[PDB]
Protein backbone atom coordinates (compact mmCIF):
# COMPACT_ATOMS: atom_id res chain seq x y z
CA UNK A 1 0.00 0.00 0.00
CA UNK A 2 2.47 2.61 -1.36
CA UNK A 3 4.86 0.32 0.47
CA UNK A 4 4.33 -1.67 -2.72
CA UNK A 5 4.83 0.70 -5.66
CA UNK A 6 7.60 2.32 -3.74
CA UNK A 7 9.47 -0.36 -1.82
CA UNK A 8 11.59 -1.46 -4.77
CA UNK A 9 10.92 1.32 -7.26
CA UNK A 10 12.33 3.74 -4.72
CA UNK A 11 15.55 1.69 -4.73
CA UNK A 12 15.79 1.32 -8.52
CA UNK A 13 18.52 3.46 -10.20
CA UNK A 14 16.18 5.38 -12.56
CA UNK A 15 14.19 6.84 -9.67
CA UNK A 16 17.18 7.00 -7.34
CA UNK A 17 18.91 9.29 -9.89
CA UNK A 18 15.81 11.44 -10.65
CA UNK A 19 15.81 12.39 -6.98
CA UNK A 20 19.41 13.51 -6.65
CA UNK A 21 19.56 15.30 -9.97
CA UNK A 22 16.65 17.32 -8.57
CA UNK A 23 18.32 17.71 -5.17
CA UNK A 24 21.55 19.04 -6.74
CA UNK A 25 19.70 21.48 -8.96
CA UNK A 26 18.06 22.76 -5.78
CA UNK A 27 21.25 23.42 -3.76
CA UNK A 28 23.11 24.22 -6.99
CA UNK A 29 21.18 27.46 -7.10
CA UNK A 30 18.03 26.78 -9.12
CA UNK A 31 14.73 27.07 -7.38
CA UNK A 32 12.80 23.90 -8.35
CA UNK A 33 9.09 23.92 -7.52
CA UNK A 34 6.95 21.61 -5.33
CA UNK A 35 9.16 22.12 -2.22
CA UNK A 36 10.81 18.78 -1.49
CA UNK A 37 8.42 18.64 1.47
CA UNK A 38 5.37 18.72 -0.87
CA UNK A 39 6.67 16.55 -3.75
CA UNK A 40 4.79 13.44 -2.54
CA UNK A 41 1.44 14.91 -1.28
CA UNK A 42 -0.69 12.97 -3.78
CA UNK A 43 0.21 9.66 -2.10
CA UNK A 44 -0.26 11.21 1.31
CA UNK A 45 -3.77 12.61 1.03
CA UNK A 46 -5.03 9.47 -0.70
CA UNK A 47 -3.78 5.91 -0.07
CA UNK A 48 -3.61 3.09 -2.62
CA UNK A 49 -6.65 1.34 -1.24
CA UNK A 50 -8.79 4.47 -1.13
CA UNK A 51 -8.21 5.45 -4.70
CA UNK A 52 -11.80 5.78 -5.95
CA UNK A 53 -11.14 8.15 -8.88
CA UNK A 54 -7.88 8.99 -10.74
CA UNK A 55 -7.24 12.36 -12.45
CA UNK A 56 -4.04 12.70 -14.51
CA UNK A 57 -2.23 16.03 -14.85
CA UNK A 58 1.02 17.04 -16.55
CA UNK A 59 3.77 18.88 -14.57
CA UNK A 60 3.51 21.30 -11.63
CA UNK A 61 2.70 24.97 -11.75
CA UNK A 62 5.95 26.88 -12.33
CA UNK A 63 4.96 30.20 -10.81
CA UNK A 64 5.48 31.10 -7.12
CA UNK A 65 3.25 29.64 -4.40
CA UNK A 66 0.91 27.86 -6.81
CA UNK A 67 1.74 24.15 -6.70
CA UNK A 68 1.70 22.08 -3.51
CA UNK A 69 1.89 18.45 -4.67
CA UNK A 70 -1.61 17.90 -6.05
CA UNK A 71 -2.36 18.11 -9.73
CA UNK A 72 -4.50 21.15 -10.69
CA UNK A 73 -4.91 22.32 -7.05
CA UNK A 74 -3.36 25.69 -6.06
CA UNK A 75 -2.82 27.07 -2.53
CA UNK A 76 -5.62 28.82 -0.46
CA UNK A 77 -5.15 32.26 -2.07
CA UNK A 78 -3.63 31.87 -5.52
CA UNK A 79 -5.68 32.77 -8.57
CA UNK A 80 -7.76 29.87 -9.89
CA UNK A 81 -5.96 28.68 -13.06
CA UNK A 82 -7.76 28.57 -16.43
CA UNK A 83 -8.25 24.81 -16.44
CA UNK A 84 -9.31 24.55 -12.80
CA UNK A 85 -11.64 27.48 -13.44
CA UNK A 86 -13.12 25.50 -16.34
CA UNK A 87 -13.42 22.27 -14.34
CA UNK A 88 -15.55 24.51 -12.10
CA UNK A 89 -17.77 25.64 -15.00
CA UNK A 90 -18.50 22.01 -15.84
CA UNK A 91 -19.16 21.26 -12.18
CA UNK A 92 -21.51 24.12 -11.36
CA UNK A 93 -23.42 23.02 -14.48
CA UNK A 94 -23.28 19.19 -14.23
CA UNK A 95 -23.73 18.66 -10.47
CA UNK A 96 -26.83 20.55 -9.25
CA UNK A 97 -25.83 20.11 -5.62
CA UNK A 98 -22.99 22.64 -6.15
CA UNK A 99 -21.99 26.33 -6.38
CA UNK A 100 -18.30 27.33 -6.69
CA UNK A 101 -15.73 27.70 -3.84
CA UNK A 102 -13.51 30.86 -3.99
CA UNK A 103 -10.13 29.22 -4.36
CA UNK A 104 -8.27 26.37 -6.03
CA UNK A 105 -7.43 24.24 -3.01
CA UNK A 106 -8.62 20.72 -3.83
CA UNK A 107 -7.25 18.78 -0.82
CA UNK A 108 -10.83 18.03 0.07
CA UNK A 109 -11.22 15.87 -3.10
CA UNK A 110 -7.83 14.38 -2.19
CA UNK A 111 -8.90 12.94 1.15
CA UNK A 112 -12.08 11.61 -0.50
CA UNK A 113 -10.07 9.15 -2.61
CA UNK A 114 -9.53 11.31 -5.70
CA UNK A 115 -5.93 10.74 -6.78
CA UNK A 116 -4.61 13.90 -8.41
CA UNK A 117 -1.44 12.61 -10.13
CA UNK A 118 0.95 14.67 -12.25
CA UNK A 119 2.93 12.49 -14.69
CA UNK A 120 6.06 14.62 -14.04
CA UNK A 121 6.45 15.58 -10.35
CA UNK A 122 8.75 18.66 -10.44
CA UNK A 123 9.35 21.75 -12.57
CA UNK A 124 11.81 24.62 -12.74
CA UNK A 125 10.45 28.02 -11.77
CA UNK A 126 9.40 29.74 -14.95
CA UNK A 127 10.34 26.83 -17.21
CA UNK A 128 7.36 24.65 -18.13
CA UNK A 129 7.98 20.94 -18.76
CA UNK A 130 11.65 21.49 -18.02
CA UNK A 131 12.14 18.40 -15.83
CA UNK A 132 10.67 16.08 -18.44
CA UNK A 133 13.65 13.79 -18.97
CA UNK A 134 14.70 12.84 -15.46
CA UNK A 135 12.44 9.85 -14.79
CA UNK A 136 9.25 11.09 -13.24
CA UNK A 137 7.26 9.47 -15.99
CA UNK A 138 8.69 5.99 -15.62
CA UNK A 139 7.93 6.18 -11.88
CA UNK A 140 4.47 7.61 -12.50
CA UNK A 141 3.93 4.92 -15.17
CA UNK A 142 4.71 2.35 -12.46
CA UNK A 143 2.08 3.91 -10.17
CA UNK A 144 -0.71 3.63 -12.77
CA UNK A 145 0.17 0.02 -13.60
CA UNK A 146 -0.01 -0.85 -9.90
CA UNK A 147 -3.38 0.85 -9.55
CA UNK A 148 -4.42 -1.16 -12.58
CA UNK A 149 -2.95 -4.36 -11.11
CA UNK A 150 -3.94 -4.41 -7.42
CA UNK A 151 -7.25 -2.51 -7.73
CA UNK A 152 -10.76 -2.96 -9.08
CA UNK A 153 -13.36 -0.45 -10.23
CA UNK A 154 -11.33 2.76 -10.30
CA UNK A 155 -12.45 5.61 -12.52
CA UNK A 156 -9.73 7.09 -14.65
CA UNK A 157 -10.69 10.66 -15.61
CA UNK A 158 -8.35 11.08 -18.61
CA UNK A 159 -8.23 14.58 -20.14
CA UNK A 160 -6.18 15.53 -23.21
CA UNK A 161 -4.51 13.27 -25.80
CA UNK A 162 -1.44 13.33 -23.64
CA UNK A 163 -2.98 11.96 -20.43
CA UNK A 164 -5.74 9.94 -21.97
CA UNK A 165 -4.48 7.42 -24.46
CA UNK A 166 -0.68 7.97 -24.68
CA UNK A 167 -0.03 7.71 -20.92
CA UNK A 168 -3.05 5.61 -19.98
CA UNK A 169 -3.57 2.03 -21.17
CA UNK A 170 -5.62 0.70 -18.28
CA UNK A 171 -7.75 -2.50 -18.19
CA UNK A 172 -10.96 -1.08 -19.71
CA UNK A 173 -13.12 -3.72 -17.90
CA UNK A 174 -11.31 -3.81 -14.56
CA UNK A 175 -11.50 -0.04 -14.35
CA UNK A 176 -13.77 2.62 -15.83
CA UNK A 177 -11.93 4.80 -18.33
CA UNK A 178 -13.66 8.05 -19.35
CA UNK A 179 -11.98 10.18 -22.02
CA UNK A 180 -12.40 13.84 -23.12
CA UNK A 181 -10.48 16.96 -24.35
CA UNK A 182 -8.33 18.97 -21.91
CA UNK A 183 -10.18 21.61 -19.85
CA UNK A 184 -7.73 24.25 -21.23
CA UNK A 185 -9.50 27.27 -22.78
CA UNK A 186 -7.77 26.52 -26.12
CA UNK A 187 -9.86 23.32 -26.00
CA UNK A 188 -12.66 23.20 -23.39
CA UNK A 189 -15.18 24.66 -25.82
CA UNK A 190 -15.67 22.88 -29.15
CA UNK A 191 -15.64 19.63 -27.58
CA UNK A 192 -15.13 19.14 -23.81
CA UNK A 193 -17.69 20.98 -21.71
CA UNK A 194 -20.46 18.65 -22.79
CA UNK A 195 -19.10 15.56 -20.98
CA UNK A 196 -20.43 14.54 -17.55
CA UNK A 197 -17.31 13.00 -16.05
CA UNK A 198 -17.94 14.17 -12.50
CA UNK A 199 -21.56 12.94 -12.39
CA UNK A 200 -20.75 9.74 -14.30
CA UNK A 201 -17.81 9.06 -11.99
CA UNK A 202 -20.17 9.22 -9.04
CA UNK A 203 -22.91 7.35 -10.85
CA UNK A 204 -20.87 4.20 -11.24
CA UNK A 205 -19.74 4.27 -7.49
CA UNK A 206 -23.25 4.28 -5.95
CA UNK A 207 -23.84 1.55 -8.53
CA UNK A 208 -21.16 -0.58 -6.86
CA UNK A 209 -22.60 0.59 -3.56
CA UNK A 210 -19.43 2.59 -2.90
CA UNK A 211 -19.90 5.92 -1.17
CA UNK A 212 -19.85 8.70 -3.80
CA UNK A 213 -17.55 11.74 -3.93
CA UNK A 214 -18.33 15.30 -2.86
CA UNK A 215 -16.87 17.51 -5.63
CA UNK A 216 -17.58 20.67 -3.62
CA UNK A 217 -14.21 22.09 -2.47
CA UNK A 218 -13.85 23.35 1.10
CA UNK A 219 -10.80 24.98 2.91
CA UNK A 220 -9.15 23.48 6.11
CA UNK A 221 -6.51 24.42 8.91
Amino acid sequence: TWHDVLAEEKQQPYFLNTLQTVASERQSGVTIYPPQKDVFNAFRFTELGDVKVVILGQDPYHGPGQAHGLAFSVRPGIAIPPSLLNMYKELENTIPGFTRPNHGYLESWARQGVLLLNTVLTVRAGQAHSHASLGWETFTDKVISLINQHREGVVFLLWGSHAQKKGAIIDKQRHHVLKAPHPSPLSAHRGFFGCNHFVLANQWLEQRGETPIDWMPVLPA
Binding site: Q58, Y61, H62, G63, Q66, A79, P81, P82, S83, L85, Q127, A128, H129, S130, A132, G160, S161, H162, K166, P181, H182, S184, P185, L186, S187, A188, H189, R190
Partner: protein, 70 residues
Protein backbone atom coordinates in the same frame (compact mmCIF):
# COMPACT_ATOMS: atom_id res chain seq x y z
CA UNK B 1 3.23 41.78 -16.31
CA UNK B 2 1.17 39.34 -18.39
CA UNK B 3 1.08 36.54 -15.86
CA UNK B 4 0.97 33.12 -17.40
CA UNK B 5 -1.02 30.88 -15.02
CA UNK B 6 -0.55 27.47 -16.65
CA UNK B 7 1.23 25.75 -19.52
CA UNK B 8 -0.39 22.72 -21.10
CA UNK B 9 1.43 20.40 -23.49
CA UNK B 10 -0.58 19.35 -26.55
CA UNK B 11 0.06 17.21 -29.65
CA UNK B 12 0.04 18.34 -33.30
CA UNK B 13 -3.42 16.84 -33.85
CA UNK B 14 -5.15 18.43 -30.83
CA UNK B 15 -3.91 21.85 -31.87
CA UNK B 16 -4.66 21.31 -35.56
CA UNK B 17 -8.20 20.49 -34.52
CA UNK B 18 -8.58 23.98 -33.08
CA UNK B 19 -6.12 26.20 -35.01
CA UNK B 20 -6.94 24.79 -38.44
CA UNK B 21 -3.15 24.59 -39.05
CA UNK B 22 -0.93 21.73 -37.89
CA UNK B 23 2.06 22.44 -35.61
CA UNK B 24 5.15 20.43 -36.56
CA UNK B 25 5.71 19.17 -33.00
CA UNK B 26 4.42 19.41 -29.44
CA UNK B 27 2.86 22.72 -28.51
CA UNK B 28 2.71 24.51 -25.20
CA UNK B 29 -0.48 26.39 -24.52
CA UNK B 30 0.54 29.18 -22.15
CA UNK B 31 -2.53 30.75 -20.64
CA UNK B 32 -3.05 34.05 -18.81
CA UNK B 33 -6.62 34.74 -17.65
CA UNK B 34 -8.16 38.19 -17.37
CA UNK B 35 -10.66 38.48 -14.51
CA UNK B 36 -12.12 41.70 -15.91
CA UNK B 37 -12.59 41.54 -19.72
CA UNK B 38 -13.04 37.82 -19.08
CA UNK B 39 -10.47 36.95 -21.71
CA UNK B 40 -8.02 34.08 -21.98
CA UNK B 41 -4.71 35.07 -23.56
CA UNK B 42 -2.91 32.04 -25.04
CA UNK B 43 0.68 31.83 -26.31
CA UNK B 44 1.37 28.60 -28.20
CA UNK B 45 5.08 27.81 -28.23
CA UNK B 46 7.21 24.81 -29.16
CA UNK B 47 8.26 22.40 -26.39
CA UNK B 48 11.22 22.95 -24.03
CA UNK B 49 13.90 24.19 -24.08
CA UNK B 50 13.30 26.50 -27.04
CA UNK B 51 9.81 27.89 -26.45
CA UNK B 52 9.85 29.16 -30.05
CA UNK B 53 6.51 31.06 -30.56
CA UNK B 54 4.06 29.36 -32.91
CA UNK B 55 0.68 31.11 -32.62
CA UNK B 56 -1.32 33.55 -30.50
CA UNK B 57 -4.99 32.89 -29.81
CA UNK B 58 -7.33 35.32 -27.98
CA UNK B 59 -10.63 33.92 -26.65
CA UNK B 60 -13.66 35.81 -25.28
CA UNK B 61 -16.47 35.15 -22.72
CA UNK B 62 -18.28 32.75 -25.02
CA UNK B 63 -15.42 30.95 -26.70
CA UNK B 64 -14.77 32.80 -29.90
CA UNK B 65 -11.14 32.46 -30.97
CA UNK B 66 -9.12 35.23 -32.57
CA UNK B 67 -6.12 33.32 -33.93
CA UNK B 68 -2.84 34.79 -35.23
CA UNK B 69 0.23 32.96 -36.51
CA UNK B 70 3.58 34.02 -35.14
Amino acid sequence: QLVIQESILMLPEEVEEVIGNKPESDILVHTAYDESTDENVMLLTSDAPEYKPWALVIQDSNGENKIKML
